[PDB]
Enzyme design. Structure first.
Site, PDB file in Angstrom:
ATOM      1  N   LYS A  16       6.173 -39.576 -74.163  1.00  0.00           N
ATOM      2  CA  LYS A  16       7.517 -39.942 -74.405  1.00  0.00           C
ATOM      3  C   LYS A  16       8.345 -38.851 -73.736  1.00  0.00           C
ATOM      4  CE  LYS A  16      10.797 -40.320 -78.260  1.00  0.00           C
ATOM      5  NZ  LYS A  16      11.140 -41.190 -79.428  1.00  0.00           N
TER       6      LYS A  16
ATOM      7  N   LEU B 184       5.794 -47.667 -69.819  1.00  0.00           N
ATOM      8  CA  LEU B 184       5.281 -48.472 -70.895  1.00  0.00           C
ATOM      9  C   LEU B 184       6.398 -49.055 -71.714  1.00  0.00           C
ATOM     10  CD1 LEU B 184       2.251 -46.244 -72.066  1.00  0.00           C
ATOM     11  CD2 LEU B 184       2.201 -48.392 -70.765  1.00  0.00           C
TER      12      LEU B 184
ATOM     13  N   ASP C 137      13.846 -47.520 -88.729  1.00  0.00           N
ATOM     14  CA  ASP C 137      13.842 -48.370 -87.489  1.00  0.00           C
ATOM     15  C   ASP C 137      12.620 -49.175 -87.260  1.00  0.00           C
ATOM     16  OD1 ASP C 137      15.122 -49.543 -85.330  1.00  0.00           O
ATOM     17  OD2 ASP C 137      14.826 -47.792 -84.064  1.00  0.00           O
TER      18      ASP C 137
ATOM     19  N   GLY D 137      15.244 -42.575 -73.870  1.00  0.00           N
ATOM     20  CA  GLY D 137      14.605 -42.248 -72.580  1.00  0.00           C
ATOM     21  C   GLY D 137      13.480 -43.249 -72.368  1.00  0.00           C
ATOM     22  N   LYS D 138      12.316 -42.777 -71.941  1.00  0.00           N
ATOM     23  CA  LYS D 138      11.177 -43.669 -71.723  1.00  0.00           C
ATOM     24  C   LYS D 138       9.839 -43.145 -72.250  1.00  0.00           C
ATOM     25  CE  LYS D 138      12.225 -42.993 -66.767  1.00  0.00           C
ATOM     26  NZ  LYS D 138      11.616 -41.922 -65.924  1.00  0.00           N
ATOM     27  N   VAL D 139       8.909 -44.084 -72.387  1.00  0.00           N
ATOM     28  CA  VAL D 139       7.528 -43.774 -72.613  1.00  0.00           C
ATOM     29  C   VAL D 139       6.764 -44.206 -71.375  1.00  0.00           C
ATOM     30  CG1 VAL D 139       5.579 -44.133 -74.122  1.00  0.00           C
ATOM     31  CG2 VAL D 139       7.953 -44.272 -75.013  1.00  0.00           C
TER      32      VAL D 139
ATOM     33  N   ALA E 281      16.959 -46.243 -76.155  1.00  0.00           N
ATOM     34  CA  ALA E 281      18.075 -45.296 -76.228  1.00  0.00           C
ATOM     35  C   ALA E 281      17.676 -43.864 -75.801  1.00  0.00           C
ATOM     36  CB  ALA E 281      18.637 -45.293 -77.645  1.00  0.00           C
TER      37      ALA E 281
HETATM   38  C1  LIG Z   1       4.881 -48.331 -75.337  1.00  0.00           C
HETATM   39  N1  LIG Z   1       5.148 -47.283 -76.332  1.00  0.00           N
HETATM   40  C2  LIG Z   1       6.197 -46.876 -77.022  1.00  0.00           C
HETATM   41  C3  LIG Z   1       5.808 -45.846 -77.761  1.00  0.00           C
HETATM   42  C4  LIG Z   1       6.672 -45.179 -78.547  1.00  0.00           C
HETATM   43  C5  LIG Z   1       8.011 -45.589 -78.575  1.00  0.00           C
HETATM   44  C6  LIG Z   1       8.923 -44.871 -79.353  1.00  0.00           C
HETATM   45  N2  LIG Z   1       8.482 -43.749 -80.086  1.00  0.00           N
HETATM   46  C7  LIG Z   1       7.176 -43.386 -80.030  1.00  0.00           C
HETATM   47  N3  LIG Z   1       6.734 -42.338 -80.755  1.00  0.00           N
HETATM   48  N4  LIG Z   1       6.306 -44.095 -79.273  1.00  0.00           N
HETATM   49  C8  LIG Z   1       4.514 -45.599 -77.507  1.00  0.00           C
HETATM   50  C9  LIG Z   1       3.619 -44.728 -77.952  1.00  0.00           C
HETATM   51  C10 LIG Z   1       2.309 -44.753 -77.481  1.00  0.00           C
HETATM   52  C11 LIG Z   1       1.944 -45.720 -76.566  1.00  0.00           C
HETATM   53  C12 LIG Z   1       2.893 -46.619 -76.153  1.00  0.00           C
HETATM   54  C13 LIG Z   1       4.126 -46.516 -76.615  1.00  0.00           C
END
Ligand SMILES: Cn1cc(-c2ccnc(N)n2)c2ccccc21
EC number: 2.7.12.1
Length: 330
Positions: free
Chosen positions: A40, A16, A137, A22-24, A20
């Site tokens: 996450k 998704l 941020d 990692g990934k979601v 920095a």
């Molecule tokens: C695409 N995406 C990025 C985040 C996200 C990113 C960074 N920190 C956090 N806490 N959540 C995210 C959370 C729920 C659904 C999609 C998401």
């Protein structure tokens, strides 16, 4: 890593987002009827581990205080460790505001949607500010639609199809950098185009740096592009001066970023190549307005108040939530 399986129940089916940290990822939950969640997955690296634990502590606090997400912070469902990566499971949101705009060809959001979004953003972040937190941020990448479903119709003005959200509700994500009043404050915060001048000048920051970021977000939602197309600090301040006027003297005297200054003025040659670039792409804020009708004037009045240079003078979010820009919601 698509096909991998976490804590014996969450099967990865898509990526998704990336960062920095990692990934979601989107996972199927094999123990809850196959319905989908976001996870996450944090890199197994100290700085990201520690941010993730910090995020978990913030999320536990926020979930306990606001279990229904009245204030629109993303809901953590659980968390665990898996091959030494910290994994945080969230409700599945839709696209980021950034990804939506990008997918629509950088066409800006209509003002009525911008009103609803701005309100929700301010309400959410103000909840944080009320609980002695600063996000640090804020950016369109960290504002996500609850559902990103859209209807489409031909717009004759622009002579192409455009996407309109069915429901523009948002939530705020990414509490990995979020900082309590009593904790260590990092030297540099924010992503550059959303970064406040007090941060750039190393003067110290608090809740008002979030308000500056929000002001920048709102400009971008309105225009479809940043007014700070830069990757250099001194240039960034030159852009600020063209858009907002000279920096306050007291901030210039206090800073130790002396490289940026000559006498008590920004060390900037307007006739250089970079000077031409700034002069071409940046202009006084109200010149970006697309209409003079009162709704647009009021958005820009709020924006200018959020982009006040002196963080002690800047509008607070509690004050923002009462701005006349927001009456058409009541
Ligand atoms: C695409 N995406 C990025 C985040 C996200 C990113 C960074 N920190 C956090 N806490 N959540 C995210 C959370 C729920 C659904 C999609 C998401």
């Amino acid at each position: 890593q698509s096909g991998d399986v976490l804590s014996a129940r969450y099967e990865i089916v898509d990526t998704l987002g990336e960062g920095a940290f990692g990934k979601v990822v989107e996972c199927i939950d094999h123990k809850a009827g196959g319905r989908h969640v976001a996870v996450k997955i944090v890199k197994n690296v100290d700085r990201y581990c520690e941010a993730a634990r910090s995020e978990i502590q913030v999320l536990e606090h926020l979930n306990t205080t606001d279990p229904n997400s009245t204030f629109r912070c993303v809901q953590m469902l659980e968390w665990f460790e898996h091959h030494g990566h910290i994994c945080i499971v969230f409700e599945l949101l839709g696209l980021s505001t950034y990804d939506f705009i990008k997918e629509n060809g950088f066409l800006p959001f209509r003002l009525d949607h911008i009103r609803k979004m701005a309100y929700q953003i301010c309400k959410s972040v103000n909840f944080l500010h009320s609980n002695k937190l600063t996000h640090t941020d804020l950016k369109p990448e960290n504002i996500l639609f609850v559902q990103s479903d859209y209807t489409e119709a031909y717009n004759p003005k622009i002579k192409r199809d455009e996407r309109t959200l069915i429901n523009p509700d948002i939530k705020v994500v990414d509490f990995g950098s979020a900082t309590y009043d009593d904790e260590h404050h990092s030297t540099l915060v924010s992503t550059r185009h959303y970064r406040a001048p007090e941060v750039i000048l190393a003067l110290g920051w608090s809740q008002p740096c979030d308000v500056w970021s929000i002001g920048c977000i709102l400009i971008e939602y309105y225009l479809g592009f940043t007014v700070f197309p830069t990757h250099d600090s001194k240039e960034h301040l030159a852009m600020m001066e063209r858009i907002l006027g000279p920096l306050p003297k007291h901030m210039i005297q206090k800073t130790r970023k002396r490289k940026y200054f000559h006498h008590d003025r920004l060390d900037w040659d307007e006739h250089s190549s970079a000077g031409r670039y700034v002069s071409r792409r940046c202009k006084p804020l109200k010149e970006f307005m697309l209409s003079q009708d009162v709704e647009h004037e009021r958005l820009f009045d709020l924006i200018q108040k959020m982009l006040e240079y002196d963080p002690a003078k800047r509008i607070t979010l509690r004050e923002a939530l009462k701005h006349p820009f927001f009456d058409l919601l009541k």
